[PDB]
Amino acid sequence: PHRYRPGTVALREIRRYQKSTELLIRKLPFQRLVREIAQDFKTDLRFQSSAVMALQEASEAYLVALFEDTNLCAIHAKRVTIMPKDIQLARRIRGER
Amino acid sequence: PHRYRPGTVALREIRRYQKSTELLIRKLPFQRLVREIAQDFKTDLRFQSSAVMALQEASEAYLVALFEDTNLCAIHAKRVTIMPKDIQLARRIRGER
Amino acid sequence: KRHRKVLRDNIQGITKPAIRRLARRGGVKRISGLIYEETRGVLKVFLENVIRDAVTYTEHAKRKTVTAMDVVYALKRQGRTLYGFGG
Amino acid sequence: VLRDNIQGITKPAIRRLARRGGVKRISGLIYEETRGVLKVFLENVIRDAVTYTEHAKRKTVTAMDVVYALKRQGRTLYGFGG
Amino acid sequence: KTRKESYAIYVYKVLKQVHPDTGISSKAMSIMNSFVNDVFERIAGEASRLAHYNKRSTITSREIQTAVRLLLPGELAKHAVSEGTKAVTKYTSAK
Amino acid sequence: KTRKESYAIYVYKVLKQVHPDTGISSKAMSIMNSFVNDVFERIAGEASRLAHYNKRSTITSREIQTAVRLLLPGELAKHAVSEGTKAVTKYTSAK
Amino acid sequence: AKTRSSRAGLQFPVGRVHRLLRKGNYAERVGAGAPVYLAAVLEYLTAEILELAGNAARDNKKTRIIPRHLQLAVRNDEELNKLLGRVTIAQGGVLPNIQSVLLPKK
Amino acid sequence: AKTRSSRAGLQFPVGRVHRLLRKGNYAERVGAGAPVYLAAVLEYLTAEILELAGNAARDNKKTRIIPRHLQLAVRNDEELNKLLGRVTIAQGGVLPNIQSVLLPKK
DNA sequence: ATCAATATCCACCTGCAGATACTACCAAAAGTGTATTTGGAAACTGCTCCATCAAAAGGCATGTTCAGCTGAATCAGCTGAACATGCCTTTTGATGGAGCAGTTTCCAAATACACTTTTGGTAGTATCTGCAGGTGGATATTGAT
DNA sequence: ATCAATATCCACCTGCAGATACTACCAAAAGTGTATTTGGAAACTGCTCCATCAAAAGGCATGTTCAGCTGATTCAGCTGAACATGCCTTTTGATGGAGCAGTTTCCAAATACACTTTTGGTAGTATCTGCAGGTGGATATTGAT
Ligand SMILES: [Mg+2]
């Protein structure tokens, strides 16, 4: 019976994911989500597959940057745990509100 | 023998200044600072009166707004006192750092 | 075409593990349980804004297909320029 | 009484600005920090304005030189032309 | 000496329709003028871009329209689009 | 089968100049292609505005020059200005 | 002779708008409706702001609109605020607003 | 029989850059030096990025520059990082960077 | 420290994807040359409006005092990380057509040029007034007790 | 609570900075009539690649467990708020002169147009090679003790 202490796999993962460049959201789920939102703006639309890829690349890049900013907000609060309030502070300061 | 509590006048001034629109830096000091800074870019420069004005308007707007985000950053860390870190966090998230 | 499957609740395909991976790439060690819904919301707003503009470009061109270029131009308008897809 | 111009931006003036921004209590170190920030702001904007001046073969920075610099720095200002 | 143009009088005409007893400071009018010029550039700029994207040599009301949609927030876009299509109808039918 | 142009062969030439045993993936070339188009559009835009602001109808190498000083940061601007000046001087004398 | 503005029922100069578009290098060519459309939109947006700035004047017991009135008008309206969200109105000040944690205790 | 590129001592295409300036409607007229000067700047910047990207390829024992290398190049260089501070390189990943307080012990 | 469970780092290999190659060709380029149009530098100059400075105004540098904030120390409760476990969902590879995108004809529409009419910016002189800035006194707010 | 120091409120008054009003004016747009050039919907159809179906690769959901994080509590001490005004810097206003902006000029350079050549793209069919993803095998990291 063996166990890593909480935080050890987490750091392992940070090193792993910061080292690679593959998209981290599954393709199809993300694709449905796009098609859904789009349909709600306009019916009977098609997407070039690269257009979905473009969106996915943008979206993941946006979200990863948002989390660094979020992480900074937590740390500023003397925490190591990101919370919705941190995301909210980031987005206000960023002028997304 | 009558003294106001810490923060009473602070609140009073917030109300006063949030109500007015005058510039809150003295014209002359600001004009020198502008000219000094411009000197490193080109010598023997003259400035329109309205150009110095425009710069002041923009600087004070900029700084007032940064104090808003700064204040939010202090509050996020459960404080009421703005500190250089709060300015730093604000400028980092704004993408100025 | 006969029949056209109903899309609903797809936001949920953005799973807890996928969101954890993105946090990781973003250098996050610890994640409170409430982050996942919050992230789903934020992503939804992000996509709506980009897809609206993308689709607007599509319609202006009188097309039925959204191009890599429509998205690239939408991304540019919103100050999130993308390289790697034709723009 | 020899003194840098940056110091002309005084404690009470910086305090007033903070106040307009809704700030109640201010750490002592804020004043130097703010001066630093303001200096970078003016540098960036002035650099760009002067660059407009030089281009126009002038020796006077015009309000329009400033207005245009502000526009490309993403800080559009209204009320000084353009 | 050289004539310095402005939207100032048109702004002033519109002020009167909207608030016939209300005046406007110089500084305020300058700001209003900036505003018009700004939005002008933003809309034209987007329309230009649109034309180019679609290999077209002309900026037509369709471009200004899409431009307005892309630039204006929800409700403001809608009303502006309606005022826009309105004005073009009215102008066409008029001899 | 419409002809889609890019900067790819020029990026490749320049690549050979600096790193003679190094190749570039087609995705990496795509990004390189995007980057040139981007910087082109950004310089051409600044040049465009600059001309207008100065009631000029012509974009000269002087306009490009200021655009570069406006757009690029410090050291990249200094060096880019050399190389463009160098190329114009050498262009003028070369006929 | 009858102005294109009066034909389109507009206070805003269709003629000038037309011209400014040509000498703007926006495209090679410019259709006839574009300036009409564009001018309407500008008139429209001018009205909205003037309306709300007037109201703002009224509130403060004034008949002359000043910058402060344009600022209060724009930042108290969600949609105008968003459109002008990277714009500074000279001499506008800010909306009165104090974070509640900064208020003294009851 | 000589191209303007060779005349200017450039790899990048002066003709092409001339052509693209005209159709982009940046101004009525395009001077003769402009495409020369711009094509040079373009070539300078692309050389600078390729140099740095090449090094990242080599630091990883690779022979073919891929998007990750472009990203390592840009993000590691203060000036290229600012020039492209609002741009995203598809397939570029991020820089390894873990904040201090997150690491183990004291 | 010692042991050991587990991740990590090499090194070496091998199919094959995707990259470099090449030969045919071509349309759309860029180049060359000669004719005609003009933008903007260049030079003189007139009048703002900008730097300078004396006199009049008035905001701030000072140091002392202590209320109340920030941050360290401590702790219980419980959230969120790790992991084992069962299997559903996505990924990968191979077959039908909606729609995009490429060619062409053709007129509805925008350009151009010159002309004739008015509008809008300025300046002139004067014309007018909304309100910032001051008074007085009534009432609210804050803080001491 | 009460009591009093001071801030805040409203009303009314008043001079003038800054607004609206005005006519000449003239010059420069904007609009009107005539001839020219050009763009892009509609009609048509090749053909790319998008949507939509079945088989294989592995990531997701869920429950359990407890490590350690968060956020409450308390508290000492440090640090920023408030305070009074003579004192020194900024503001207001007065006046030459830099330079910016208006104007006219003329030519080097740009547009235009018309063969003439070069080249950058693709397409067809081939040919090469960097490295991703598999293996096993040697060394680091981690956590119990
Ligand atoms: Mg739906």
Residue numbers in the entry:
A (entry chain E), B (entry chain A): 38 to 134
C (entry chain F): 16 to 102
D (entry chain B): 21 to 102
E (entry chain H), F (entry chain D): 28 to 122
G (entry chain G), H (entry chain C): 14 to 119
Quoted from the paper:
We next conducted co-treatment trials with RAPTA-T and AUF simultaneously present in the treatment buffer and observed that both ruthenium and gold adducts are generated readily at distinct histone sites. The RAPTA-T adducts form at the same two adjacent locations observed for the RAPTA-T only treatments, RU1 and RU2, whereas AUF generates adducts at two symmetry-related locations, AU1 and AU1′, which are not far from the central base pair and situated along the twofold axis of the nucleosome. The gold ions are coordinated to the imidazole delta nitrogen atoms of H113 and H113′ from the two H3 histone proteins. The AUF sugar-thiolate groups have been substituted by the histone ligands, and the Au-triethylphosphine units fill a narrow, but shallow, access channel to the exposed nitrogen groups of the histidine side chains. The triethylphosphine groups make extensive hydrophobic contacts with surrounding H3 residues, which entail interactions with both copies of H3 for a given adduct. The requirement for the presence of both RAPTA-T and AUF in the NCP treatments to allow gold adduct formation at AU1 and AU1′ suggests that the RAPTA-T adducts promote reactivity of the H3/H3′ H113 sites. However, the closest distance between any two adduct atoms of RU1/RU2 and AU1/AU1′ is 27 Å. In NCP crystals, there are at least five solvent accessible histidine imidazole groups available for metal compound binding, but we only observe AUF adducts at the one type of histidine site, H113 of H3/H3′ (and only when RAPTA-T is bound in the acidic patch). In the RAPTA-T/AUF–NCP crystal structure, there are two equivalents each of ruthenium and gold per nucleosome. The RAPTA-T binding results in dynamic remodelling of a major portion of the histone octamer in the nucleosome, which is linked to decreasing the average size of both of the H3/H3′ H113 binding pockets, yielding closer and more favourable hydrophobic contacts that promote AUF association.
Although DNA has to our knowledge not been reported as an AUF target, we had previously discovered that certain metal-based compounds can form site-specific adducts on the histone proteins that package DNA into the basic repeating unit of chromatin, the nucleosome. We therefore investigated this as a possibility for AUF targeting here and found that AUF and RAPTA-T both form histone protein adducts in the nucleosome core, albeit at distantly related sites. Moreover, the presence of RAPTA-T substantially facilitates AUF adduct formation. This synergism elicited by RAPTA-T and AUF appears to be mediated via an allosteric mechanism within the nucleosome, which has biological implications and may open up new avenues for drug development beyond metal-based drugs.
